Amino acid sequence: SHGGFLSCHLIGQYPETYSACVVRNPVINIASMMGSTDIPDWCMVEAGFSYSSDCLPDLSVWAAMLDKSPIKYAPQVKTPLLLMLGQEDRRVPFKQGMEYYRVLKARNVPVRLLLYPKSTHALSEVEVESDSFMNAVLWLCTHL
Amino acid sequence: EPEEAAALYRGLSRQPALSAACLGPEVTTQYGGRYRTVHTEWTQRDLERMENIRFCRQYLVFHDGDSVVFAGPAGNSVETRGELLSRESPSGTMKAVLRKAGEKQFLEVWEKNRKLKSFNLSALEKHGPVYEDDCFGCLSWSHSETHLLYVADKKRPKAESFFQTKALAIKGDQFLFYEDWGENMVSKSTPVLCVLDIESGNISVLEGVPESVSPGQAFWAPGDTGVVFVGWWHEPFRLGIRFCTNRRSALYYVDLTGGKCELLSDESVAVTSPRLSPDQCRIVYLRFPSLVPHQQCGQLCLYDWYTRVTSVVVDIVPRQLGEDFSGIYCSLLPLGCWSADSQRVVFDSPQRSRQDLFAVDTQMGSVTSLTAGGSGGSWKLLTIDRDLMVVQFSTPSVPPSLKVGFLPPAGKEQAVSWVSLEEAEPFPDISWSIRVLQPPPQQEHVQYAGLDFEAILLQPSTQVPMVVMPHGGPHSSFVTAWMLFPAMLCKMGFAVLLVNYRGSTGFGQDSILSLPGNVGHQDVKDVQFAVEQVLQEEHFDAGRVALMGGSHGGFLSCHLIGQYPETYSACVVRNPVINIASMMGSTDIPDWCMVEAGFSYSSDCLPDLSVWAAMLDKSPIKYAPQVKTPLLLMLGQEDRRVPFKQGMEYYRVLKARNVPVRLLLYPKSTHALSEVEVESDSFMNAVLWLCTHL
Amino acid sequence: EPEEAAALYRGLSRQPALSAACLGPEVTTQYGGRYRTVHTEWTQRDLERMENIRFCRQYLVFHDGDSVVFAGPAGNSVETRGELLSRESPSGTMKAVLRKAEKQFLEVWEKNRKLKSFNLSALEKHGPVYEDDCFGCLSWSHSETHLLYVADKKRPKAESFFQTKALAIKGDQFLFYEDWGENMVSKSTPVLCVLDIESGNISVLEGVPESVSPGQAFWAPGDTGVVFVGWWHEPFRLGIRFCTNRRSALYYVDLTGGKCELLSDESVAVTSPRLSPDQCRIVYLRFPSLVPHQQCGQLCLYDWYTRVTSVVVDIVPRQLGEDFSGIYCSLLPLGCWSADSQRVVFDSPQRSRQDLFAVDTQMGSVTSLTAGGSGGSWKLLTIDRDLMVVQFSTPSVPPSLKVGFLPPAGKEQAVSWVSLEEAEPFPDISWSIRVLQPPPQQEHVQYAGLDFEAILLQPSTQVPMVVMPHGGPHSSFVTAWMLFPAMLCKMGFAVLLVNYRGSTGFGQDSILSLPGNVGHQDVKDVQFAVEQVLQEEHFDAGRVALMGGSHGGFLSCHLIGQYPETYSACVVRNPVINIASMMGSTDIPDWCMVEAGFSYSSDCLPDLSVWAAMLDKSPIKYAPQVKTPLLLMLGQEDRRVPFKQGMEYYRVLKARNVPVRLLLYPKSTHALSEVEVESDSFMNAVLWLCTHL
Amino acid sequence: DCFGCLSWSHSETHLLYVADKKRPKAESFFQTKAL
Ligand SMILES: *C(=O)[C@@H]([C@@H]1N=C(C(=O)O)[C@@H](S[C@@H]2CN[C@H](C(=O)N(C)C)C2)[C@@H]1C)[C@@H](C)O
Ligand SMILES: *C(=O)[C@@H]([C@@H]1N=C(C(=O)O)[C@@H](S[C@@H]2CN[C@H](C(=O)N(C)C)C2)[C@@H]1C)[C@@H](C)O
Ligand SMILES: *C(=O)[C@@H]([C@@H]1N=C(C(=O)O)[C@@H](S[C@@H]2CN[C@H](C(=O)N(C)C)C2)[C@@H]1C)[C@@H](C)O
Numbered sequence A: 001s002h003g004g005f006l007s008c009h010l011i012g013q014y015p016e017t018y019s020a021c022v023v024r025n026p027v028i029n030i031a032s033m034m035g036s037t038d039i040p041d042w043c044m045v046e047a048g049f050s051y052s053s054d055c056l057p058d059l060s061v062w063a064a065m066l067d068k069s070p071i072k073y074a075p076q077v078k079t080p081l082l083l084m085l086g087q088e089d090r091r092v093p094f095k096q097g098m099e100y101y102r103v104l105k106a107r108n109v110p111v112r113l114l115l116y117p118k119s120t121h122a123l124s125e126v127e128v129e130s131d132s133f134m135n136a137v138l139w140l141c142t143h144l
Numbered sequence B: 001e002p003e004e005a006a007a008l009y010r011g012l013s014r015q016p017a018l019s020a021a022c023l024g025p026e027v028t029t030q031y032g033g034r035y036r037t038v039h040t041e042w043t044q045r046d047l048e049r050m051e052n053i054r055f056c057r058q059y060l061v062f063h064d065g066d067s068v069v070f071a072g073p074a075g076n077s078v079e080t081r082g083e084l085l086s087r088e089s090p091s092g093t094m095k096a097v098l099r100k101a102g103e104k105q106f107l108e109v110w111e112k113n114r115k116l117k118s119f120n121l122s123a124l125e126k127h128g129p130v131y132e133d134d135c136f137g138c139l140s141w142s143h144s145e146t147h148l149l150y151v152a153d154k155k156r157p158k159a160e161s162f163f164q165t166k167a168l169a170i171k172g173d174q175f176l177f178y179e180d181w182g183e184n185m186v187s188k189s190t191p192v193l194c195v196l197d198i199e200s201g202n203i204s205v206l207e208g209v210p211e212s213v214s215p216g217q218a219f220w221a222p223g224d225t226g227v228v229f230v231g232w233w234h235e236p237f238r239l240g241i242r243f244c245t246n247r248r249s250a251l252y253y254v255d256l257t258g259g260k261c262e263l264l265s266d267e268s269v270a271v272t273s274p275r276l277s278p279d280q281c282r283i284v285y286l287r288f289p290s291l292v293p294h295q296q297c298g299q300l301c302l303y304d305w306y307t308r309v310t311s312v313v314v315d316i317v318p319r320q321l322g323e324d325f326s327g328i329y330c331s332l333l334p335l336g337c338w339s340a341d342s343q344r345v346v347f348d349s350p351q352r353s354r355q356d357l358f359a360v361d362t363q364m365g366s367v368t369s370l371t372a373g374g375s376g377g378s379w380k381l382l383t384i385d386r387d388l389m390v391v392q393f394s395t396p397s398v399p400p401s402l403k404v405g406f407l408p409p410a411g412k413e414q415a416v417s418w419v420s421l422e423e424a425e426p427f428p429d430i431s432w433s434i435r436v437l438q439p440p441p442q443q444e445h446v447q448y449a450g451l452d453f454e455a456i457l458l459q460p461s462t463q464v465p466m467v468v469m470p471h472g473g474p475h476s477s478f479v480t481a482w483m484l485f486p487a488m489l490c491k492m493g494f495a496v497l498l499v500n501y502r503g504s505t506g507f508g509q510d511s512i513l514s515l516p517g518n519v520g521h522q523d524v525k526d527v528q529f530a531v532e533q534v535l536q537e538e539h540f541d542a543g544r545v546a547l548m549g550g551s552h553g554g555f556l557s558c559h560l561i562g563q564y565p566e567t568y569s570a571c572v573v574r575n576p577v578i579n580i581a582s583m584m585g586s587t588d589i590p591d592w593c594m595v596e597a598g599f600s601y602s603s604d605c606l607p608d609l610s611v612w613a614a615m616l617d618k619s620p621i622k623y624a625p626q627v628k629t630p631l632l633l634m635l636g637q638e639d640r641r642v643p644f645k646q647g648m649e650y651y652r653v654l655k656a657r658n659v660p661v662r663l664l665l666y667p668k669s670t671h672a673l674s675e676v677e678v679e680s681d682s683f684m685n686a687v688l689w690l691c692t693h694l
Numbered sequence C: 001e002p003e004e005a006a007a008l009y010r011g012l013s014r015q016p017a018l019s020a021a022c023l024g025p026e027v028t029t030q031y032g033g034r035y036r037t038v039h040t041e042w043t044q045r046d047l048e049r050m051e052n053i054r055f056c057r058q059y060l061v062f063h064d065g066d067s068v069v070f071a072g073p074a075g076n077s078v079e080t081r082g083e084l085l086s087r088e089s090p091s092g093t094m095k096a097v098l099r100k101a102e103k104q105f106l107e108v109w110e111k112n113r114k115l116k117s118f119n120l121s122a123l124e125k126h127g128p129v130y131e132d133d134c135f136g137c138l139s140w141s142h143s144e145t146h147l148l149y150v151a152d153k154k155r156p157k158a159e160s161f162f163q164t165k166a167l168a169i170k171g172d173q174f175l176f177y178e179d180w181g182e183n184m185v186s187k188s189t190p191v192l193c194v195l196d197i198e199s200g201n202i203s204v205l206e207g208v209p210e211s212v213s214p215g216q217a218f219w220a221p222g223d224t225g226v227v228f229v230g231w232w233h234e235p236f237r238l239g240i241r242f243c244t245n246r247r248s249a250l251y252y253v254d255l256t257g258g259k260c261e262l263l264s265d266e267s268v269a270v271t272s273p274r275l276s277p278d279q280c281r282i283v284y285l286r287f288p289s290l291v292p293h294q295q296c297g298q299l300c301l302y303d304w305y306t307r308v309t310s311v312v313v314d315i316v317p318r319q320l321g322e323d324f325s326g327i328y329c330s331l332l333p334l335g336c337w338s339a340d341s342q343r344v345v346f347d348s349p350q351r352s353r354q355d356l357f358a359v360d361t362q363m364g365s366v367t368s369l370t371a372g373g374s375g376g377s378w379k380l381l382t383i384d385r386d387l388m389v390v391q392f393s394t395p396s397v398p399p400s401l402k403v404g405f406l407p408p409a410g411k412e413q414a415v416s417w418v419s420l421e422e423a424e425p426f427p428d429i430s431w432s433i434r435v436l437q438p439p440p441q442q443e444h445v446q447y448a449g450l451d452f453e454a455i456l457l458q459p460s461t462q463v464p465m466v467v468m469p470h471g472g473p474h475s476s477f478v479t480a481w482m483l484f485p486a487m488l489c490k491m492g493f494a495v496l497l498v499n500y501r502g503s504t505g506f507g508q509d510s511i512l513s514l515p516g517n518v519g520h521q522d523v524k525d526v527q528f529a530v531e532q533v534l535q536e537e538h539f540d541a542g543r544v545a546l547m548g549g550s551h552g553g554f555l556s557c558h559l560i561g562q563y564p565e566t567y568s569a570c571v572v573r574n575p576v577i578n579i580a581s582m583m584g585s586t587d588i589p590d591w592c593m594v595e596a597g598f599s600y601s602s603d604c605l606p607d608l609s610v611w612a613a614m615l616d617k618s619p620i621k622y623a624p625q626v627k628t629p630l631l632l633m634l635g636q637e638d639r640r641v642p643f644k645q646g647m648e649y650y651r652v653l654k655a656r657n658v659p660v661r662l663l664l665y666p667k668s669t670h671a672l673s674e675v676e677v678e679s680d681s682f683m684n685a686v687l688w689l690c691t692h693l
Numbered sequence D: 001d002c003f004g005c006l007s008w009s010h011s012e013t014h015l016l017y018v019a020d021k022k023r024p025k026a027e028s029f030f031q032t033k034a035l
Helices: A002-013 A040-047 A059-067 A070-076 A095-105 A126-143 B002-012 B484-491 B509-514 B522-538 B552-563 B580-584 B590-597 B609-617 B620-626 B645-655 B676-693 C002-012 C483-489 C508-513 C521-537 C551-562 C579-583 C589-596 C608-616 C619-625 C644-655 C675-692
Strands: A021-023 A081-086 A111-116 B017-023 B034-046 B051-063 B068-073 B078-080 B083-088 B095-101 B104-111 B114-120 B139-141 B147-153 B191-197 B203-205 B213-220 B226-233 B249-255 B261-263 B270-276 B282-288 B299-304 B310-314 B344-351 B354-361 B367-369 B378-385 B388-395 B398-406 B418-422 B430-437 B453-460 B466-470 B495-500 B545-550 B570-574 B631-636 B661-666 C017-023 C034-046 C051-063 C068-073 C078-080 C083-088 C095-100 C104-110 C113-119 C138-140 C146-152 C190-196 C202-204 C212-219 C225-232 C248-254 C260-262 C269-275 C281-287 C298-303 C309-313 C343-350 C353-360 C366-368 C377-384 C387-394 C397-405 C417-421 C429-436 C452-459 C465-469 C494-499 C544-549 C569-573 C630-635 C660-665 D006-008 D015-017
Touching (some): A002 A021, A002 A070, A021 A126, A040 A059, A070 A095, A081 A095, A081 A126, A095 A111, B002 B484, B002 B676, B017 B398, B078 C078, B095 B139, B114 C034, B139 B213, B147 B213, B191 B213, B213 B270, B249 B270, B354 B378, B430 B484, B430 B522, B453 B484, B453 B522, B466 B522, B466 B552, B484 B495, B484 B676, B495 B522, B545 B552, B545 B676, B580 B590, B590 B609, B620 B645, B631 B645, B631 B676, B645 B661, B661 B676, C017 C387, C017 C397, C034 C387, C068 C417, C083 C138, C095 C138, C146 C212, C212 C248, C212 C269, C225 C269, C248 C269, C353 C377, C429 C521, C452 C483, C465 C521, C465 C551, C483 C494, C494 C521, C521 C551, C544 C551, C551 C619, C569 C675, C579 C589, C579 C608, C579 C644, C589 C608, C619 C644, C630 C644, C630 C675
Parallel strands (some): A021 A081, A081 A111, B466 B545, B545 B570, B631 B661, C465 C494
Antiparallel strands (some): B017 B034, B034 B051, B051 B068, B051 B078, B083 B095, B104 B114, B139 B147, B147 B191, B191 B203, B213 B226, B270 B282, B282 B299, B354 B367, B378 B388, B388 B398, B398 B418, B430 B453, B453 B495, C017 C034, C034 C051, C051 C068, C095 C104, C104 C113, C138 C146, C212 C225, C225 C248, C281 C298, C343 C353, C377 C387, C387 C397, C429 C452, C452 C494
């Protein structure tokens, strides 16, 4: 979630420190998340503006949102990454991870993507939880 | 009145439409006469069962030489269930059918009054589900009539969980992501070519297809030595393919055994619809030379099998080539399109506001119109065999009808005589006409000067209210054919105006290329000018004008109610485009937003402030605060080309300001809303909204 | 060899069979030619989908008014799904279809359009529609404005005593409703329904007597009323399927008012009425005795305007010439009248053949249209404007389709058949007919001089033989295409099918000879036929086997019990084992009383003498003597012959330590007709026979 | 645990809880009716 956002920022801004990364449902582009999330005021508040139900698009605001998102640093990434998305998540739409995945794949960076068609943000079902934990452990033990 | 509207819809929806036709072998009699049979397939809506039913019918044609002497029916209609694909053999003695039953998929071979053979594809376990669409699917007979060729999904390795219990597969791969080809292509990721031997019943998957292409539209090469197919590039990722002709692809030939594959055309443009000639010496196909627009004017090209020479038979038309031809705009050719001499080809294409039939000589390059002149109408060519054509004809006030004809010899194709096989009853209370519009001086394009456009007006045969419809696309158009909803509106007392603004297909390549980079400014003004001219000319009631549109047509309607708030009294939209910038990151065709905004598209892009501002400046949401027209919104929750959150954002903006809005959400429908129940419900709701608010 | 047998079965089961045919309207040409279309329906087994599939085909016939000039195909076959009944209109312009899709829909088609559709379930005027040949029907009005059919009567709603209602009769949920027996599950009381096409309204006719079940209805002349057949169901119902001895009568009822009148006698059985093209007279079949389940019948005629009834064709004791022996069909073709409204055509068994006959209703003469030759089986599917469509087959030739023209009166024997669809013969099978004369010690006390027949198939000595008696016992074998006998013949066996005294098609004396003698006269006829055939063809006497079902299994058990040294193997299907125990559990209790030699009464009570006779006539009495290995195959849901009879026989044999193999099908009836069950049973039987000989 | 609850009255004779609001029934424009 907000913790996957930070991890992508870290691997984009410090390309030498880390050698592996796993993210479940990261926030990737704050500007494009506003129109699809169930809590649009979160995007406004965390970017430094006041939310209003009558507010319309304003290019000045949309500039701040883009400058604070990890996608901006995509071209500098080299760390192998594992993505695990839930297709029914309503707070963080799963297209967010897809954009990052496409950007990384266009540059031949090693990426592994798992998609759970019936899971929400938490991936809390026993089968999904066990499979995701096993895959993450295997990734970490192999790439280190 | 809901009851009267329901009765009218019941009456209008009963008219069926043609889907396919084929011809049988010739038969001789001891008296010397000659006749042959025609097989046709029809589809019809059924409101009691709430489903689309499909049935078959057969006809008889007695001919003496190259002339039709008599035609008649040969029995009653028979309903069918579970047929995906079917193809008669070259000699006409056997028939191959793909069916779903049980569900499982079966391949059946019929001869006369017996089902000779059946194969259970699921049990053999050599591949996945078979493709039945028109993009990749096919079903072809060998020239020896011993083998069959088709396309099916590639087999995936078995996977299992880390914690399975075994009795006293790759672990962890159950949820690996497989990318599919987009809207109306759910679960279709990578096809493969499959060959079935009828005698032995063994299935093989051909080897040698390049790893980075998806194959399709395959047929047997001369001598049955190999297979010719079209490959679409899917690296680094797939872009929506349905309803687009600008996807990079090429033509390949592959040997039956060995793995050798050779390229037969260029590899930088789009190609489609290859057809081998009856003499087996040449191939004709369609080529689109730029990848920018989703629909455009195309070229007709020819390839010689034995000399290996490629040539251009028909080239791009900038504005017009005479008064009858304006370019090639069809996305496919008929399955049977060659004349008996293996020198001429026949097809159908839009031409301004009509749809006509054309014959092309592949040696000289001349194009001849077979249906020129008259008031108008829409023709469709279903097949040709031994110089006998089967066609469908319709107009805005006449449901589809079936005809047959003989293609005259070279140089006299305009003297064709049509014979009727199945006629339809007209509706004399609808009258239709075509209007031509010339943009005013202040609206001329900087580089393409002098373009004009058109509209189609239907009216009963200042008192009459009017409804305005722009088409989607934006590179599409309306043609003077049978349309259910406009006919219903006309029979309820409305007048209907369908607008083909600059950028529509069938008016030259200049019209196609004039629109990009100007969406939201040029088309809106074209529609407004047409509305004003029609109002001033026919003297309709200016206080009862309404709008109705889907997809890009909804985008235009929202723009219009936002920029001219005092002109329209009601509006109905379906799956509209509302915010291009936010749409870019969620649609299956991201290149469309960039192209229509006025920029080039490339993979490995990145968000930029300038491009995002340009996209935001062209969106109808910017005018939301000015709107005061009552609005009805209808959305499909599973639409993948236009996500349903655009309409939700528009709805929230309007709701926060106390504007009257009515929202309907269909949780299992796509962009089309083509299911019988959903379609009927949406049409009834729209008609009631229009009648109540005007 | 299981693989070779499976391949042979796959090859043989591919041949389709005809089920129905109809003719279309005549069409003229500017050149003067005249042609018309023929619509046919076929059915075929599919082993991959394990199901019976049905498809349709169409043909064209060009004629000159009295002769066929050309015939040809008019397209490919089209498979169909969910069609229960269908009927073309009198003028040939519309078509009515009953479909299931589950719900039931009545549809009307005209050219390339599904004009109308009606959802019967939603209207809620009746229950499921009848689709069988006993009660079901679907008829057009002469004005082509109304439709008539038959459906189950609506039952009042019921609910439990403890239902919870939001803030019907209580206790009637499990009331018993009696049905009509085997292959008639859940069918209790039908009713006549009329649908008006223009308005959409359904009505249930009033005036049917409370104590009858109506069926086989059609519109009366002038569309004033309806003519139907009513079967008595008091005090309780007896099995109706495959029986022609159920009491019934013919009734006419007005459309509105409730007046109902009787048109025939009320003490015998009547069936199969057909109105003439001119709408002046009606023919039907009458059976005057209720004792036997099949017998010789009469053909009777009724005049609409004079109200006079007469007998056109009467019972035949032994024979009427060398070509006719009586009427033994249970139904007439839907279209059976000549264009002059004076002659009728039908098909019937005749000794060991099945022939076509034409009858003049004014003079009463019967003429055979297919007399002479080696044999064969014909079936007439329809006639319209003097054009007949027929199916033909033989033991070594699968079914074929032909058309013909009926010659004028006095010359019907000169008919010329034109082939529409031919089948490929099997030249490795040869068949013949044998005649057998019982010896002096086996003559009947009252019917002296009767002889019987057998059909012998063989490849074209050390040849093994398989013997088959038919069920019934009032039934028979005819020289037609039979799948299993052909499969056996193609594997190297010889096959002998026996028509013992009491079979249909040999006169009423043969029918009446058997009752009261089951287990004695039928067992000795079969044994005599086997002995006679063995000594003449010089087959291997040490490799003779038996195979039979129902009454044929009863005979086979009797034979292996009374002649333990003659047969080396035996296969039976749903056999009758103990008549006395059968009486109290079957759906046709009168059969046990009649075949044992007594009369049946609805108020009968158990008696010692009758029970003793039934026990003395049962094969179980010979169980201790049996030593032949046995394969027994039973269907658990059979209602005419409960599956406990075979269980008792199996228990006795097992307790005596005899080799036995038992198969039980938990969802099958007496026929074992499902594709999977049928194939499994045939393969098991073939393997048993091959291994044990 | 945002809206749901289950409560006893002090007299212990009544119960209180929360549930979704009832919605009026609807039907298609083409539904067939029992004659
Ligand atoms: C991701 O961080 C998005 C949202 N913020 C949340 C947070 O507070 O961490 C989560 S919900 C929260 C986390 N664990 C609990 C939980 O998920 N369940 C009990 C199911 C509560 C939420 C996805 C953030 C970007 O808004
Ligand atoms: C909306 O217009 C979006 C896309 N453009 C379309 C168009 O060409 O009109 C449609 S698809 C096309 C229109 N009618 C056909 C159809 O819908 N079916 C056959 C189901 C094909 C498409 C959603 C545009 C904004 O991208
Ligand atoms: C067994 O023979 C029992 C009954 N008599 C029969 C007979 O006539 O042979 C059968 S029904 C008859 C035979 N073949 C047809 C058939 O089985 N189907 C169409 C399914 C009809 C019946 C069980 C006898 C002991 O009563």
